[PDB]
């Protein structure tokens with residue numbers, strides 16, 4: 001099948017489950033603590049890899065021991081880590097995550113080596129990006145780097161897939177180069193200025209994105225699935241119903257598995273189905289990367305449906 | 306000529322500290338500007354402030370059997386602390402704290418108790434002779450309530466001074482408050498224990514009175530920058546700190562508490578003792594991290610005599 005390049009961050013996630021988020025000056029004690037591999041780019045690369053994509057990963061670790069471990073792990077996740085650079089004198093990214101009794105989380109991130117993923121590292125991968133069928137990125141990498149790689153993909157008819165997370169505003173210049181974008185509700189509001197409270201809102205935020213030049217807009221709607229729109233023709237694809245347990249990286253899982261399905265030439269709806277399945281398994285498991293399902297598991301889930 | 310012996314009982318953590326502009330909002334993700342891993346824990350911080358400050362101090366505590374646990378034990382030994390009564394709990398990891406510090410320097414902390422949770426009444430009871438023979442016992446609320454109470458009762462029956470730093474904030478039973486001789490709440494803890502909001506010295510007087518009536522002779526409610534309200538059996542008095550430029554106030558109270566007990570064991574009167582503690586903490590607030598920000602006695606004297 002087609003060839004995927006993911007470009008994004010790598011973190012070590014520290015996750016503490018608690019009842020309520022601490023308020024300023026406060027101290028709370030948690031009930032479960034976990035250390036695992038995270039980072040939006042790595043989570044997405046792992047969802048692609050484990051889903052069965054031909055994927056290569058552009059990213060940076062620091063020169064430390066954790067960076068060493070994550071590289072070895074990534075290689076076992078069906079990912080070509082040849083373009084994963086090692087930044088001398090730099091530490092591997094870290095995320096500190098609190099998850100409350102509802103399942104809401106807040107996240108603090110130490111960028112470390114992720115900030116060292118520069119336009120010049122992108123340019124060194126020109127050829128790789130020019131030959132890929134698709135390029136998938138998020139916003140935990142330097143914007144200038146996302147922009148440089150989007151330009152190369154566009155020049156070379158590589159599908160640009162952008163998951164605009166974490167939330168922030170983005171220039172028209174970037175948005176015009178994107179073919180598929182996957183905002184959640186907060187992002188869609190941040191990018192279009194339209195608050196997304198229902199399917200009719202979803203279709204409105206989508207329209208503003210189609211006029212920015214983006215043909216395929218998917219607005220994830222949490223447990224309400226996704227609003228999928230292709231130049232203005234839109235419908236909701238409900239997700240599967242499961243006993244959720246951990247939502248971190250659900251969207252990561254969804255993006256990685258979406259692109260995998262699309263590059264197998266499955267049509268959008270079959271592909272969203274594939275993806276919704278993968279995420280639903282993911283929300284029944286703990287942590288980010290440990291939660292990411294394998295193809296066989298995603299295929300066994302769909303048969304059971 | 307050594308002062309009376311001090312026993313510190315409480316927690317030990319590895320601190321993961323991320324400076325950023327604004328605390329993350331729900332569903333939000335923010336990138337910070339600085340990250341640091343350091344030794345922490347309220348009990349360890351206080352043990353180190355007392356040790357560096359010159360006390361004769363022994364530390365009752367539990368680490369896990371991981372590498373961080375061994376590293377913290379080695380480091381504590383070099384801080385003039387007797388670590389003999391620091392237990393290695395097999396099968397557990399050392400405590401961990403995740404900390405965000407915002408642009409002003411307000412902080413938020415989530416803690417995974419790990420081995421700290423193993424500090425049981427059986428373990429305290431094994432230190433019975435030690436608590437009974439010490440001149441003072443300093444504790445906080447990062448250790449299981451049952452254990453703080455067992456320690457307080459041993460100390461009380463042997464006229465070992467019980468000094469309690471009631472942090473993190475929570476409600477305590479009368480049964481414990483009756484055994485305390487010196488308490489050091491901040492304005493938030495004072496409120497949680499008395500029900501009285503503390504915004505000024507007058508409020509502090511009221512809050513102290515409730516604590517005094519609960520049985521606590523010496524009540525020191527810290528007022529951040531404004532200093533401290535010191536009260537003994539209802540006789541209150543304000544004692545200002547020093548003014549300095551703040552970068553990081555993690556472990557400020559801890560420093561205060563540790564050097565406070567040290568100077569009182571040196572028989573310095575309360576006013577001067579508090580002034581010595583103020584001086585330690587004021588230095589501490591100009592340095593990052595917790596234990597790494599705690600000053601040595603040499604530096605405290607130099608700073609006091611300077612200005």
Ligand SMILES: Nc1ncnc2c1ncn2[C@@H]1O[C@H](COP(=O)(O)OP(=O)(O)CP(=O)(O)O)[C@@H](O)[C@H]1O
Pocket residue numbers: 165184185220221222223225226239240241242244247248249250251252253254275276279280283
């Ligand atoms: N509770 C739930 N039950 C079943 N599926 C769920 C689910 N919550 C999320 N999903 C699936 O995961 C996808 C992403 O959900 P969501 O809108 O919450 O992404 P997100 O912004 O939280 C993502 P991420 O954290 O990786 O960015 C949804 O499209 C849906 O398929």
Ligand SMILES: Nc1ncnc2c1ncn2[C@@H]1O[C@H](COP(=O)(O)OP(=O)(O)CP(=O)(O)O)[C@@H](O)[C@H]1O
Pocket residue numbers: 472490491492527528529530532533546547548549551554555556557558559561582583584586587590
């Ligand atoms: N901004 C500041 N400038 C100078 N000294 C300060 C200071 N903030 C705190 N201190 C020192 O620390 C002592 C206690 O401060 P504070 O009331 O903030 O403790 P706290 O319980 O709120 C936090 P913590 O115990 O973690 O420091 C003060 O008496 C003072 O000695």
Ligand SMILES: OC[C@H]1O[C@H](O)[C@H](O)[C@@H]1O
Pocket residue numbers: 011012013037038039040043094095107140248249252288
């Ligand atoms: O999407 C979840 C991820 O975001 C943050 O990047 C964490 O590292 C976590 O793995």
Ligand SMILES: OC[C@H]1O[C@H](O)[C@H](O)[C@@H]1O
Pocket residue numbers: 318319320344345346347350402414416447555556557559595
């Ligand atoms: O008082 C600051 C300390 O309290 C918390 O317990 C952290 O460990 C930190 O070192």
Ligand SMILES: [Cs+]
Pocket residue numbers: 246247248249250282283284285286287288291
């Ligand atoms: Cs998960």
Ligand SMILES: [Cs+]
Pocket residue numbers: 553554555556557589590591592593594595598
């Ligand atoms: Cs400090």
